[PDB]
Design a protein around this ligand. Sequence first.
Ligand SMILES: O=c1[nH]c2cc(C(F)(F)F)c(N3CCOCC3)cc2n(CP(=O)(O)O)c1=O
Ligand SMILES: CCCCCCCCCC
Lengths: 403, 50
Amino acid sequence: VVTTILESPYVMMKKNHEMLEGNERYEGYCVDLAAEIAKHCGFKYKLTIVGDGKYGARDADTKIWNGMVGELVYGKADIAIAPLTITLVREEVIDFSKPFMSLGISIMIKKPQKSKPGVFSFLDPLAYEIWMCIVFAYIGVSVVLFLVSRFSNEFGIFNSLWFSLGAFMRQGCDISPRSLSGRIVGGVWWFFTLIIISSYTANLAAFLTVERMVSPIESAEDLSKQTEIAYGTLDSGSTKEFFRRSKIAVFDKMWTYMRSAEPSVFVRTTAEGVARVRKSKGKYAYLLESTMNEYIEQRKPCDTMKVGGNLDSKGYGIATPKGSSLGNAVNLAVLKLNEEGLLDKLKNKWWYDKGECGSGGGDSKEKTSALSLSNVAGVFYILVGGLGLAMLVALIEFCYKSR
Amino acid sequence: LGISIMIKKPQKSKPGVFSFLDPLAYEIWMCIVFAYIGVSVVLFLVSRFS
Ligand SMILES: O=c1[nH]c2cc(C(F)(F)F)c(N3CCOCC3)cc2n(CP(=O)(O)O)c1=O
Ligand SMILES: CCCCCCCCCC
């Protein structure tokens, strides 16, 4: 007479549960765990799911345990082969195994996918500092060419800025320097433009060929500092109580943010939380138990992923009432299962082998597409802006010269 | 003998006649033509003021 719980990856009801019902045919990770714990410790067990459907807790006035703690303290069932977060209160009333699985408060974010190419994206292949240095190098070269042609000759400032700009944009030059000191400047600026244009084309080809996606946030230590991404918990439970009772600097900040923030970042249920993460953009991050997050990221549509380590560690046990002669028959078997590499094999199978998606198959899967007008339109805007400006200055010069 | 794979035979996949235009979408080429006409007319207009 062992209890259980209905969490999907641990104890699940298979297709056509009417035909296959009861201890004879169940599916789940905890089901295989119970089978193996019986194989190591032969005993009569009947899978009696908890009636209440939840884990232990005591009401302050009622002072009674309910779920898989009430089913154990009150002799309603032998043990509880199900995920129990080992904790002080539960231990004080049950006898806990050595943790057969350790976990923590993971961070859940939507899988980083390529954004819409912004306006002014054409100047991505070169850093901002390089663009500014290009502008001021052009303005320095033109001034020096002017000064050189006016020591020792139509290279006035206006007519030399045009030559430098013509030489940069690969379009043929109208005139060429004749002196030696003008020709040195011409030659070195020609070399400079050649190298820069080759660098821009090559780096753009690198951008287009292999795409490299980066997670916007890596760990909660930086998620606290960001604050442009909203991150939320479940309503109330281990996670919220942990954050309110925390005293570490980063966690205290991550709680002060979420305590006073609008709208309601706290989510009613984990299904709503994952739905909100998937629906929204990368502006929402969800803080849940590590196991649930690892499991969720494997099912369809595989649109989410786990980032960063576990914030605080706690383990899952196999409960047993204090006076049981079976109390010490489970510690040793759990330790042996953990040491044999059997529990890890069970989890690996149950989570990755029964996985909706695989990482290796879509690892590269690279396909290239034609440059849409969205990528480029940042230069069409500049073109039409330049034309409008040219007409404007033409009218200004005309009006000034007419009077 | 043994268990063996079986996949659809990859076709020759001959390229299109005007396949050289692929690296830029249709909209980009046509807006290039239209911006060319616009720039030519604006340059002419600005050049001529009496
Ligand atoms: O003993 C407890 N064990 C628990 C085990 C699990 C899980 F491992 F996932 F099955 C969860 N979930 C976390 C989110 O995914 C679905 C349910 C809650 C548990 N809670 C309530 P908490 O206080 O919110 O942790 C307990 O009290
Ligand atoms: C899709 C066919 C249109 C391409 C026109 C190419 C001409 C551009 C040079 C002005």
